[PDB]
DNA sequence: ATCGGATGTATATATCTGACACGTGCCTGGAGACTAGGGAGTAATCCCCTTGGCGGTTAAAACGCGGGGGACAGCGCGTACGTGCGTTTAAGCGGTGCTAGAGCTGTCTACGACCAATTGAGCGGCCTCGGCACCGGGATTCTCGA
């Protein structure tokens, strides 16, 4: 309400368009020894310190979850995107590409991302179950599908009568306080009777659900060709912030789409299984945009997502991919995204192979 | 009110050990058994202190009633005291060495223990009377407004 000037918080200011290329002037270059963060190349220890795990569900206490179309991710220093070699005779040959950052994820495996949960959403990493207290809420996994066919599961550990979880997929723009299907960008199942919920509309084109159901979830979206028919460029936003005691990265998320025309992604579908037994097709009409597996809680619902290598009734398809596979695929993809952005800003020129892949 | 840095503190680790849990052979206090006396326990009696009540009095308590006096809150300053860092200093380890004095045993003896015979120092009880307590009144001195 003042002017096109300094950011809304004096805690950290990013370089405005008039202060272009202003890197986040957060912590000073003068660091303390510390000792705990003095890991070297000879030691074998994961620098991403996961919090203490507790059998009772807990809350991430100092994480400002996504809002206003503003995505929030973990940050690590990464003082140099590694390009160190011998001192070449030409002192103007190589570029260090000092991004001084990375999207390192606080996860041993592809799990339910804590960055995209509601403040009323509790997790227990003993089974990575998710639970709530009042009404409905939504959580999502770490990964997100953009093409191909894949598959995961949800295991339900507690379903009292006043406890009805919902399980399915949701694109970004999905308000994580809504019950996973209240908008047109989410398609789920209600875990009282198998009922497909989308646009808050319930449809009985489905089988029946059981209290101890280990439910399999198969979903096939077309390649990014039929998804976009154009450039699927991924120019990323990256902003450095130093929240109360830790460094984090902000990126710009998508905006609420007013899409009211139906253009289904070609040959995309969703299939639901009960313990591998085909519960049937859920949604053939699938809108564009990346999707991610999501779970909605009612009052005190206990469910958990699960990947493929520890499966119970897996499909024997050679094309579908477990949660972990697409997870590390997207992780490596965002690594290359950081690489390319630091290249763009740091070294003149860019170049990519024969487009098709 | 927050964050960053400094610093101080709780933790895991490793090993060293010397207290310490453990077991012995040997000692004597504890148990076991037996005898006596007599402290203690019971009971009937007496006394007599206490606990109870009753009526009259007022000094005392209840209660009220200003109101000056200080409890208290605040406010300035400043001096004395925490602090961190200097400095130097005896404190502690430890180990040595001598023995003065605890600390033990073996007498033997004076010394109460104890009992018995004796009684007069002392104690309950009974007059008694004089400092003492009370009272009334006069004179003295503190105190609160000039």
Curated annotation (Swiss-Prot):
Ubiquitously expressed. Predominantly expressed in adult heart and testis and fetal lung and liver, with barely detectable expression in adult lung, liver, kidney, prostate, and peripheral leukocytes. Residues 1-60 are annotated as: Disordered. It comes from the Eukaryota. One of its GO terms (biological process) is hemopoiesis. GO terms for cellular component: histone methyltransferase complex; MLL1 complex; MLL1/2 complex; MLL3/4 complex; nucleoplasm; nucleus; Set1C/COMPASS complex. It is found in: Nucleus. This is Set1/Ash2 histone methyltransferase complex subunit ASH2. The gene is ASH2L.
């Amino acid at each position: 309400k003042q002017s096109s000037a300094v950011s809304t918080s004096g805690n950290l200011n990013g370089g405005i368009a008039a202060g272009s290329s202003g890197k986040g002037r957060g912590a000073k270059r003068k660091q303390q020894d510390g000792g705990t963060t003095g890991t070297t190349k000879k030691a074998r220890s994961d620098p991403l310190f996961s919090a203490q795990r507790l059998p009772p569900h807990g809350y991430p206490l100092e994480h400002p979850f996504n809002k206003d179309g503003y995505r929030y991710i973990l940050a690590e220093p990464d003082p140099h995107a590694p390009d160190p070699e011998k001192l070449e005779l030409d002192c103007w040959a190589g570029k260090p590409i000092p991004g001084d950052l990375y999207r390192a994820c606080l996860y041993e495996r592809v799990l339910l991302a804590l960055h995209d949960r509601a403040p009323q959403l509790k997790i227990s990493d003993d089974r990575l179950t998710v639970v709530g207290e009042k009404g409905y809420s939504m959580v999502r996994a770490s990964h997100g599908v953009r093409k191909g066919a894949w598959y995961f599961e949800i295991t339900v550990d507690e379903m009292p009568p006043d406890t009805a979880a919902r399980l399915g997929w949701s694109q970004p723009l999905g308000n994580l306080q809504a019950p996973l299907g209240y908008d047109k960008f989410s398609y789920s199942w209600r875990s009282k009777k198998g009922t497909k919920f989308h646009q808050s509309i319930g449809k009985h084109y489905s089988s029946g659900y059981g209290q101890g159901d280990v439910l399999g979830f198969y979903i096939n979206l077309p390649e990014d060709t039929e998804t976009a028919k154009s450039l699927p460029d991924t120019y990323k936003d990256k902003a450095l912030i130093k929240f109360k005691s830790y460094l984090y990265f902000e990126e710009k998320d998508f905006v609420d789409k007013a899409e009211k025309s139906l253009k289904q992604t070609p040959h995309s579908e969703i299939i639901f299984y009960k313990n591998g037994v085909n519960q049937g097709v859920a949604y053939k009409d699938i809108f564009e945009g990346v999707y991610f597996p999501a779970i909605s809680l009612y009052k005190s619902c206990t469910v958990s997502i699960n990947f493929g290598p520890c499966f119970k009734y897996p499909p024997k398809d050679l094309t579908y991919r477990p949660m972990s596979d697409m997870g590390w695929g997207a992780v490596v993809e965002h690594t290359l995204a950081d690489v390319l952005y630091h290249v763009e800003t740091e070294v003149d020129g860019r170049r990519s192979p024969p487009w098709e892949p």
